[PDB]
């Protein structure tokens, strides 16, 4: 009973939690990359105001 309980309940829940956490972290990383891209664009656009 204990073996079946572990294999059928405990492991899938932990695996699902791991999947969810990884996806959340990846989303935050993507958003920060977008912010950095905008910042670099603004830095490039500032350097040519009057030539």
């Amino acid at each position: 009973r204990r073996v079946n309980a572990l294999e059928q309940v405990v492991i899938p829940g932990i695996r699902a939690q791991i999947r969810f956490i990884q996806q959340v972290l990846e989303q935050r990383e993507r958003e920060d990359t977008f912010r950095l891209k905008r910042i670099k664009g603004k830095i490039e656009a500032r350097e040519a105001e009057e030539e």
Binding site: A5, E31, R35, R38
Partner: protein
């Protein structure tokens, strides 16, 4: 007026030049086809316009004309029994012009300019009039439409038209300073209409569903939110509220949803009858429709139009219920516009001012004393569609900081066809303690005690179900298996309700109270008889268990006798029991 030309087109966003003098949140007519747009940014000689229609085919250099006024609605007689666009255009008049497809550039009036109304004056020359006072009355579909002074108007009455029949746009009252008052006035949709005072809600909003009226009540000036994943029962719940609730007027706002549901409402509702007065149910309903394939920028306007109409009907003394089919589509529209504006997002691409807009929308609900001295109310029920069922998304979390009731739906219950699929562990309501004096004098004097007993039984069953699922129900004692069986009986006989049955679709308060009494009496007798050594299998095979399970399909007329027969049968069966 200010008049310029198009400088740049990109999606639903048009930048006009030569617009020095236009004001923020004004209305502009774009191009030769006269598409309607709104100013949201001024920059030197230019202006940023968001268009409420489709921008395909526009060319650079087309004229842009500013009307100099913000977005508004026409409030007056002729608004019930109708279906409108996002920016308040009658769809059934668009159909007569443009066939079966919605084309851009169509200009129609919101209120019909040809119908005649039986005008009965209520003021006389020499009177002093302020905002919100009643000039006269006009009949409607069983209603008495009051003509109101606009909230910013003050003066002395010079002349009044005598009783007769006139159209909307004829001046019925002329003031002494020259102002002519018609049967309708316009109001900006982004400004809340004034009131005298705000009162505390103390009467229930009866939805007709057992679980939403017993366990998690909502008052007559409150707000509620119902989030859940797709196919879990939001639309059916809101349509049941539209059909069966005790509100005088219902406003349904279908922002960004399917087009078939609005067709179903348009077809079914003229055949039904309202619970209040009689006559067709459509005579008390106003429909605002903006489907998912319609222009995205008009999703924001439809919500404001609906809430302004609901506030207008409140000012006449009615009680109004407002349903928003999804407030996530409004957030999507805001995200798209801010993406076009090149702003920095906060979370999940949403602009940082989303929570302020949500709080300003929900704050318009409540029970008030109107400027005319009457009493009205607006209750708002908004549905949320979180992505993937994730309840930590920004739109869901921003809504929970302002609403008073939180009806949470679950996909697990919806998979096994357990409807309304309300999670009774994660839901709450902050109006329960304030409605007890109403319950003690309108239903029964011991109704709160029975409700608390049922909640306690549900909590104990939820506590035992953790032990059950790992050891097995056979190992449990009889005093626990009795609780498990009673919990199943409560779950399948009381909480479960069928919205498509001819009888179970509506439930009164007294019928629910009787069912609760029957369940508690059975539990008391079974708990008493367990101590004499009777097996659980002997109790479960009693024929009276079927009577409780079939109690909800009994009509409202036959129930007060069926209840007494079932009570006497329970007493007899547990007295003759072994």
């Amino acid at each position: 007026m200010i008049q310029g030309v198009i400088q740049k087109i990109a999606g639903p966003a048009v930048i006009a030049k030569g617009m020095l003098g236009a004001r923020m949140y004004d209305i502009c007519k774009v191009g030769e086809e006269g598409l309607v747009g709104e100013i949201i940014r001024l920059d030197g000689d230019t202006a940023f316009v968001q268009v409420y229609e489709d921008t395909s085919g526009l060319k650079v250099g087309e004229p842009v004309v500013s009307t100099g006024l913000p977005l508004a609605v026409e409030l007056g007689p002729g608004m019930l029994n109708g279906i409108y666009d996002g920016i308040q255009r009658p769809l059934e008049r668009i159909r007569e012009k443009t066939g079966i497809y919605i084309t851009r550039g169509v200009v129609v009036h919101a209120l019909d300019r040809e119908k005649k109304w039986a005008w009965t004056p209520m003021v006389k020359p020499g009177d002093e009039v302020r905002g919100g006072m009643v000039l006269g009355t006009v009949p409607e579909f069983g209603f008495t439409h009051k003509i109101l002074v606009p909230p910013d108007v003050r003066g002395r009455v010079k002349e009044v038209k005598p009783a007769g029949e006139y159209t909307v746009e004829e001046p019925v009252v002329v003031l002494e300073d020259g102002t002519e008052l018609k049967m309708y006035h316009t109001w900006p949709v982004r400004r809340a209409r004034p009131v005298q005072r705000k009162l505390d809600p103390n009467t229930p909003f009866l939805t007709g569903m057992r679980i939403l009226d017993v366990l998690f009540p909502v008052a007559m000036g409150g707000t509620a939110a119902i989030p859940g994943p797709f196919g879990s029962g939001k639309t059916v719940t809101q349509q049941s509220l539209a059909k069966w609730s005790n509100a005088d007027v219902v406003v349904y706002v279908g922002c960004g949803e399917r087009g078939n549901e609005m067709t179903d409402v348009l077809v079914e509702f003229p055949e039904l009858t309202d619970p209040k007065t009689g006559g067709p149910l459509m005579h008390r309903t106003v429909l605002i429709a903006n489907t998912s394939n319609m222009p995205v920028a008009a999703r924001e306007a439809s919500i404001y139009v609906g809430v302004t109409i609901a506030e207008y009907f409140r000012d006449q003394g009615f009680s109004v219920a407002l349903m928003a089919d999804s407030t996530s589509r409004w957030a999507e529209a805001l995200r798209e516009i801010s993406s076009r504006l090149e702003e920095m997002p906060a979370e999940e691409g949403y602009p940082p001012y989303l929570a302020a807009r949500l709080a300003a929308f929900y704050e318009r609900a409540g029970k008030v004393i109107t400027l005319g001295g009457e009493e009205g109310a607006v209750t708002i029920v908004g549905a949320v569609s979180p992505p993937g069922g994730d309840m930590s998304e920004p739109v869901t979390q921003s809504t929970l900081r302002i609403v008073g009731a939180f009806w949470r739906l679950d996909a697990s219950l919806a998979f096994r066809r357990h409807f309304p699929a309300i999670n009774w562990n994660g839901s709450y309501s902050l109006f329960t303690s304030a409605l007890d004096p109403w319950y003690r004098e309108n239903v029964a004097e011991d109704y709160p005690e029975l409700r608390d007993a049922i909640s306690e039984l549900l909590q104990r069953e939820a506590g035992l179900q953790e032990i059950v699922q790992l050891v097995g129900p056979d190992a449990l004692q009889d005093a626990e298996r009795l609780v498990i069986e009673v919990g199943r009986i409560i779950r399948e006989d009381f909480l479960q309700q069928n919205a498509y049955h001819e009888v179970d679709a509506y439930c009164s308060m007294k019928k629910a109270y009787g069912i609760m009494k029957m369940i508690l009496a059975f539990y008391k007798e079974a708990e008493a008889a367990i101590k004499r050594g009777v097996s659980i299998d002997e109790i479960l095979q009693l024929p009276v268990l079927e009577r409780i399970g079939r109690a909800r399909y009994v009509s409202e007329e036959e129930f007060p006798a069926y209840f007494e027969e079932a009570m006497k049968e329970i007493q007899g069966a547990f007295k003759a029991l072994a």
